[PDB]
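Methods: holo model generation. Sequences were used as deposited, without trimming of termini or removal of tags, and paired with ligand SMILES retrieved from the corresponding compound records. Each pair was processed once, and we did not select among multiple samples. The sequence and (2R,3S)-oxirane-2,3-dicarboxylic acid SMILES for this entry were:
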Amino acid sequence: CTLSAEDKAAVERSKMIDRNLREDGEKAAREVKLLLLGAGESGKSTIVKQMKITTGIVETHFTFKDLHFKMFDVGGQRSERKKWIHCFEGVTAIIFCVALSDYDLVLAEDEEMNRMHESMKLFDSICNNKWFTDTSIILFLNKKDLFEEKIKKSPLTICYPEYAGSNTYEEAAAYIQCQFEDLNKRKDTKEIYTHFTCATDTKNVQFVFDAVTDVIIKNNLKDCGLF
Amino acid sequence: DVQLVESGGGLVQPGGSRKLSCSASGFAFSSFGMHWVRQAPEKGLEWVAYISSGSGTIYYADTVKGRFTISRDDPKNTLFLQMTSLRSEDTAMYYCVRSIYYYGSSPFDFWGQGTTLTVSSGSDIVMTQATSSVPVTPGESVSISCRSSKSLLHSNGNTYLYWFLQRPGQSPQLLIYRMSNLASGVPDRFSGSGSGTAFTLTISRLEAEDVGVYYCMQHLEYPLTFGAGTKLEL
Amino acid sequence: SELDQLRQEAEQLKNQIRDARKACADATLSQITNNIDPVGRIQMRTRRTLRGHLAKIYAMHWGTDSRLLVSASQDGKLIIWDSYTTNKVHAIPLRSSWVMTCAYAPSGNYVACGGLDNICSIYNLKTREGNVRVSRELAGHTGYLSCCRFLDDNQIVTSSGDTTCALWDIETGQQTTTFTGHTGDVMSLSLAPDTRLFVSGACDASAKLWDVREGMCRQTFTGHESDINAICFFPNGNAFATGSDDATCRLFDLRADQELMTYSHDNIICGITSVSFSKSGRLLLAGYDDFNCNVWDALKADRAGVLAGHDNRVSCLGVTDDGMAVATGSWDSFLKIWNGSS
Amino acid sequence: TCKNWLAAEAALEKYYLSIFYGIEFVVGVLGNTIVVFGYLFCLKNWNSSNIYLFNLSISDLAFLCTLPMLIRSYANGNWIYGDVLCISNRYVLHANLYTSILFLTFISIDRYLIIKYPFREHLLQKKEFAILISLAIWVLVTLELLPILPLINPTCNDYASSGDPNYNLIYSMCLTLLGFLIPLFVMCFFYYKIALFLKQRNRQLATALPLEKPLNLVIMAVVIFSVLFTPYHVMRNVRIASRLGSWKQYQCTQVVINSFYIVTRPLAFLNSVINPVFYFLLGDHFREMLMNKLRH
Amino acid sequence: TASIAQARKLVEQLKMEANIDRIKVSKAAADLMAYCEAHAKEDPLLTPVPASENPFRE
Ligand SMILES: O=C(O)[C@H]1O[C@H]1C(=O)O
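and the model returned the structure below.
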């Protein structure tokens, strides 16, 4: 009641700004956000192309069955990951890509550590992070066709000294999947969704859709006290 | 560039109705509040109506309440004034004025060109300009005085007094807002000062384009009164 | 060999520098200041609470008039606040929502921001239209931008995660000078009051002093055990303070070329996110990971007060130019203004 | 043979009512105070579920805050607080009872809508609509309970044993039909839909198959309500109908039925002590949020 | 080549660094104390201001 005319006009402008901010927040809260990770080249670009059809961080937007996704790829950030990973604390899920044909290849740095054992270290570091204690992981195992051929030429005992030994695709795939899924320590509040990536471009977005729907339903049940 | 263009004037019989339109271009129209002001033939300025940004607030002058309606259409960037039962005292030239309000802004900083309208045959702050005409020569310095009936100084440090200059055959132009600040694009020769009720505007030098009429206006409270300006002669 | 010769020469130079520094350490600052009265107990109260951000707040900066301020959030928004009345003046939507820093021009006409996109964006606040528009996009860093500070309306200095600092020219968009020599990510920078030198701190647990005009490093300061997250400059321009991940703050003197005081407590085991001085330099304010801020007697290294009232990390804090209030931002999406009571 | 029956009835009304009322009072006030404090302090965002649960807790507290006078009067054997206190205690009881009953069904509706429309895109999932519905519930229950004033006019007895049995029977049948049965049917329908959805979802995927636990909770929410509320209404209506002149038993059967109505009275109030544990404390997020405030 | 250049640059920087003159610690400490004492009365946070002059009173 002690405000001049211009003060009241400024208050009205501030109220309009508040209304616009609230509307924008409500619009943005209805989207799915995914963080995409992988160790080196593991078919990650192939997955990006599959879902779709220098600059620091790359964002991809797409729609599937009346739902909006935002995939963030941070492979271009070559700085220390410890200083900016906490920016992604509230994502819906993490998509981790692993190449199955790397079980016998060796990174050309030390000629001693093969690529698969580096992927396992990265997966262990990400899964057991303190910022991702309750974040679901969708694990993609790419290049199964190349793996099928490479199985005969090179045995799986090269990478795993303790393998029982079947030297077939059906058993080798299961063994690798078990080795990766065994790194999850707190397997009570976190889940892993595993998929062997196929050439067709429609069976991958469907899997992501199903996993994200399951995650959302469980989040709502936990919020309501029923889970 | 910023443009406001007016239409809808002309000749009207008493008791008739008319609609005036104001189309804007070159600026973010939806974020400005807008005013209609008018000037009778061979007279001074007189505030008519105000519509806020988002059309959440509307104000009218006491002499037109019940017969005039102000509205805006933001998708097409237009402002309308619909007026009914037009008396003979409404013959005037009308101006569309834009103004924006936040901390540090400058309201009333752009005026339209105006359109003409010819009609056939209480506790308001009084703003006084004693002198009504001044002859002067180039190179000298001039002081213009304005007085108020109420103290324009609010209890927040702001004094709400504005200065406008109208050159012959032109729209008014803002010079000083809030008694001390200089408008954008205005030469530094102009300055303003005052205290409470008495205010002065000083022109440190002088040129050939400063001739015209000077008006002082108050923005402390509605209905936003003017004062009959002082004419500077060569 | 020649590599061994150069390594030995570097070690000998380091030993000579250490001996030269140890020569001039006659008495400690605690001994010199053991004869001044304690500051007492400092009590402050919350005067304002600014709400409207929907995510974590990462940076804030005061205007030179001590009334307006700018804040940056990861919801994709810059907000300009009038602190006296709590009104919002401008809200600016950003192209990239991963902002990590923001700055206010001393003239009051421009704002700057940047983040995980490796770009510094400049925004013009005084336009003929009623909207705020982007003026320039400075690109050329190969890592995330962590800090930026205006020198005037046409000059700005930034620090990046590619272990580099840069001084730009806004009109042309070109890098005018480059500052290299750090071996880790540069996390902060501070400008001297005369804007002729600036100091930076990196993840290699060291700080460096740079001459703006000549573009070389004059002095290097070490002593921390972990990454340095914050850095501030003493009011007279002859000393500075650093905050690090080892839960301690330290004070360095330029002319003495060594550390003067360490501020640490046995109950603090979290890192420091921000640091600042008061108008006279007697008090040092530091924000921590354990959700509150601590006030230190700078001359005596004693605790003097605590600012509590946030539900998450204190990520940024600042003091006005006239020294009348403090501002703290946090990961709980609020800003608070603090003032003392007579 | 009803001499022993009368002695047992006197013993029940002397000891059982006071004891059960005291235990219910202490446990319920403790739990509801904990929940109210937790909501008022350790909570930032408010949605429809929070509003409904908070109002249910408030109604439970308001109901529980009217026991001590009844306990003291039953212990002493008389009323020592005035007649206006009689009409001011026995009125708040029933209004809060039925308000809580309605809030439970609105909780069920909201739980259905959360799985029908994730992201909360429905009108009924807005905070303003929730507040309006809460106010409407309070006002409508007060209006429907207003016709009870002239019947409990007094030395003041229980509701079911006061006044002419004709108007008593009419109002009792009307209130049992319009305040108990319809909300129960609505709740059963919506929880049935939820159960069908949760069965199909677990049947259409492997995952960890963990969605049996919310299915168990859905059935418990329905079982507890019915088990505790039905016998009270049945016994109250049959007791009121017993006093009727047409049903002139003129035997000991008049006493025995009365006893069968006393025992069912306190257990029906149990729903206000079970509710804070079942709807708030069994949740992991609420417990963790309270633990964090305890740490601070 | 690359390592030799890096080592030479490091040695040159180290040589350039060890050419300034360092004053005694006591002088710097006294200077800090003098600055803090000279400006003590103009610090509202250290010495609170009466409520009539506080812009943030409410
Ligand atoms: O009138 C009633 O039956 C209710 O008040 C309760 C009691 O008497 O125990």
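The domain at 1-227 of chain A is CATH 3.40.50.300 (Rossmann fold).
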